[PDB]
Copies of this chain bind each other. A is one copy, B any other.
């Protein structure tokens, strides 16, 4: 049902904050949210142009795009997710970032690489294997699926790992700049490739990229360092989900605990900040949520206070922040330090004007999980229309098309 909320107008959520080179006028952020309304060849679509535009209308909002593939080897969904590796991709994204910018808002692109969870049939069509830090699967079913089509997961070679830094992510970053993104965000969360490198359940390498906490972090820090030299540290973010068990990450049951893995990473990031190479923000998933699933208090094994104690810069937190609506006690506590942003993903899907609703205490429209991942405009841009105007059957038939 609809969520009654108290207005946040007079709260820290509407105090300006500098994030890298840009100043936000609200601390409410749209986090990366996969929806599968890109074109078949991963170019952003007409639907996406309106979708991001509709969420940019409170001037000075930060929007972070849905996970966007860095390269063909980075892909692996059956649904149509966007990419940022070709000039065509960048030119289409630029229409979208232009629209957000014309509203005085800002946009970060989340760069994803699927890794061991890439669909093996999809990858086979590209003549590629699913790849990872090590040759592992998230489940027996995943292993059987891959072996059945003769396309097993394999470990990247040392040279391939270098190629991620100097080729795949470098080109994605260059394309992101061509596309006018204000930031690029490394996806190091939720059991995808970079999280697979960081944690021991997924990384048993014996080269410089595994075999210790420091070695497992090496690829991620190499990307931070190299990409900082290309786009500047002020245009870089990173997302982590220390507590998540999404895609079979062991988290607090792994042989190295997330507090160890992620405190190591965050302290290395702060040391870079101390030397003048501080990245724009660290985005962290609160333990209330794991990937796209809520986690009971009983099941929660830690929290993200360590990030606040170790990192001195901007932090973005997300995960069921309306759980204590209408008064938003937890949100208010979490933004009290004046360097913290708060994200809403699921409610932003059904409330394109969410910043305005939270500002003025307007009831939140419930979201529709059934249309989170479908291929058409129904449950996508229809939340911007008066219900009386929406032709459902027409909109279900409205698949993504080229911009303009």
Taking Cβ atoms with an 8 Å cutoff, the residues of A that contact B are: 212-214, 252, 255-257, 259-260, 263-264, 267, 271, 301-302, 305-306, 309-310
Contacts and interface: CB of A to CB of B under 8 A. Distances in A.
Contact of A310 (B214, B259, B310): B259
Contacts of A212: 212-214
A311 B169 CA distance: 39
Given A213-B213, A252-B309, A260-B264, 13 more contacts: A212-B212, A213-B214, A255-B271, A256-B267, A257-B264, A259-B309, A259-B310, A260-B263, A260-B267, A263-B263, A301-B309, A305-B305, A306-B306
Nearest to A259: B263
Main secondary structure of the interface of A (DSSP, over half): helix
Contacts of A271: 255
Contact of A306 (B213, B259, B264): B259
7 contacts: A212-B213, A252-B310, A257-B264, A257-B310, A259-B263, A260-B263, A302-B306
A119 to B, nearest CB: 34
Contact of A309 (B255, B302, B309): B302
A304 to B, nearest CB: 12
Contacts of A256: 264, 267
A263 B263 CA distance: 9
Nearest to A274: B253
A213 B302 contact: no
Contacts of A213: 212-214, 260, 264
A247 to B, nearest CB: 22
Nearest to A301: B309
A267 B263 CA distance: 14
A306 B309 CA distance: 12
A306 B243 CA distance: 13
A268 to B, nearest CB: 9
Contacts of A259: 259, 263, 267, 306, 309-310
Contacts of A260: 213, 260, 263-264, 267
